[PDB]
């Protein structure tokens, strides 16, 4: 969907200083710090003007902070339930696999304002296994409509399909 592609492109065009500014704002809200608010407004407001179906402020802020921390390369078809699920085929089934699965499954009982730390640990698990690509646009689209059952069903089904291979 147009509106998210340009948002991710603008995020990928940032330089070291803006990435550090967003990095130092992790775990914080949009209103308390002014430089982060100004940077987010400059990056986001024209997109909301031009496109009505642009991502909401909370999801965009969360995605910006996550991208600033992790800095993955955008690639279509590399969504989270595939890389996580292809990784889960190399762990010990008895002990490590349930521990990873519980952390992956905990996301279904949290709202968009509490999905920073679990996503952080999931992306750290990804980074520990030499992963350099991720689908940011797809992740944003899923996170926008996280309160719908078919979205979660498709998420889990994709995870299972990737895992059973």
């Amino acid at each position: 969907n147009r509106g998210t592609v340009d948002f991710i492109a603008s995020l990928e065009n940032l330089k070291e200083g803006d990435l550090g500014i967003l990095r130092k704002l992790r775990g914080a809200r949009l209103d308390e710090k002014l430089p982060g608010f100004d940077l987010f407004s400059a990056l986001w407001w024209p997109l909301r003007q031009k496109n009505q179906r642009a991502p909401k402020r909370e999801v965009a802020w969360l995605i910006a902070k996550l991208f600033a921390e992790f800095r993955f390369e955008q690639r279509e078809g590399a969504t989270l339930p595939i890389l996580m699920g292809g990784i889960c085929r190399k762990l010990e089934p008895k002990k490590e696999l349930p521990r990873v699965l519980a952390r992956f499954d905990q996301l279904a009982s949290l709202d968009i304002m509490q999905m920073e730390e679990p996503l952080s640990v999931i992306m750290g698990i990804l980074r520990k296994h030499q992963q350099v690509c991720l689908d940011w646009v797809g992740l944003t689209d899923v996170l926008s409509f996280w309160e719908q059952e078919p979205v979660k069903r498709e998420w889990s089904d994709s995870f299972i399909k990737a895992y059973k291979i």
Partner: protein, 251 residues
């Protein structure tokens, strides 16, 4: 004429009616399993109750042994998918794990009353029939089955009532063919009432009615539509309006 009553009621986790195996009663609708409360439980729940005790009445409404009762009660059905649950319990000794079944659901209830049959059963009396209709409405509004209530104190009240005077009997179960899926910006009762509203928004396009919600908590129609002739926030005022339309009697 026929008076039709539609009720939407949400219940807390409880077990108000179970089968021989102890599990809550169920049914099949819309390609899924739904919770069910039997008709002969709602009847004998409204009947034989202390509140309802307010030409012998209570027989004209519900007959006994060719009495030709004038009250029709349907089977309560759920607006979503059934979600049975198991509770594991043990017994202490103060000096063996057992399991029990329970469920929570939102129910749609349908009642019908034939005015002419009620009048004929009362031997021409017309004020007594109106009093009986009002008493039945009050009793049905404030009564629940006496199941495992000592362990599940489920005494919730209905969140929406609709009274209609259609020419032919018809139920609005077809408004719940698609099970209700809860979204963040709404709740279950609101979505059920919206689904009901988008079944009388149609039909008329392709009669009158009175809508009642507690203090206008849930208004019929998610717009400024006139799908309801009158919206009333008090049960007694709803009874009075129905009494007036029946032919102008005072409650």
């Amino acid at each position: 004429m026929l008076i039709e009553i539609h009720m939407i009621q949400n219940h807390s986790p409880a077990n108000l009616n179970r089968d021989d195996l102890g599990a809550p009663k169920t049914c099949y609708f819309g390609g899924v399993l739904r919770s069910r409360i039997s008709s002969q439980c709602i009847k004998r729940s409204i009947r034989t109750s202390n509140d309802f005790k307010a030409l012998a009445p209570d027989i004209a409404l519900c007959g006994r042994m060719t009495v030709e009762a004038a009250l029709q009660v349907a089977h309560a059905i759920s607006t979503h998918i059934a979600r049975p649950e198991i509770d594991y319990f043990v017994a202490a000794d103060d000096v063996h794990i057992g399991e029990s079944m329970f469920a929570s659901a939102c129910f749609y209830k349908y009642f019908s009353i034939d005015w002419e049959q009620l009048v004929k059963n009362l031997k021409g009396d017309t004020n007594l029939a109106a009093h009986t209709v009002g008493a039945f409405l009050l009793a049905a509004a404030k009564t629940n089955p006496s199941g495992k209530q000592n362990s599940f104190a489920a005494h919730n009240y209905p969140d929406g009532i609709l009274v209609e005077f259609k020419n032919s009997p018809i139920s609005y179960a077809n408004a719940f063919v698609r099970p209700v899926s809860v979204v963040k910006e709404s709740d279950l009762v609101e979505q059920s009432i919206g689904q009901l509203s988008n079944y009388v928004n149609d039909i008329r396009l392709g009669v009158i009615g009175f809508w009642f919600s507690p203090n206008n908590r849930y208004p019929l129609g998610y717009k400024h539509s006139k799908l309801a002739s009158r919206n009333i926030g008090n049960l007694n005022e709803l009874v009075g309006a129905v009494l007036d339309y029946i032919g102008g009697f005072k409650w």
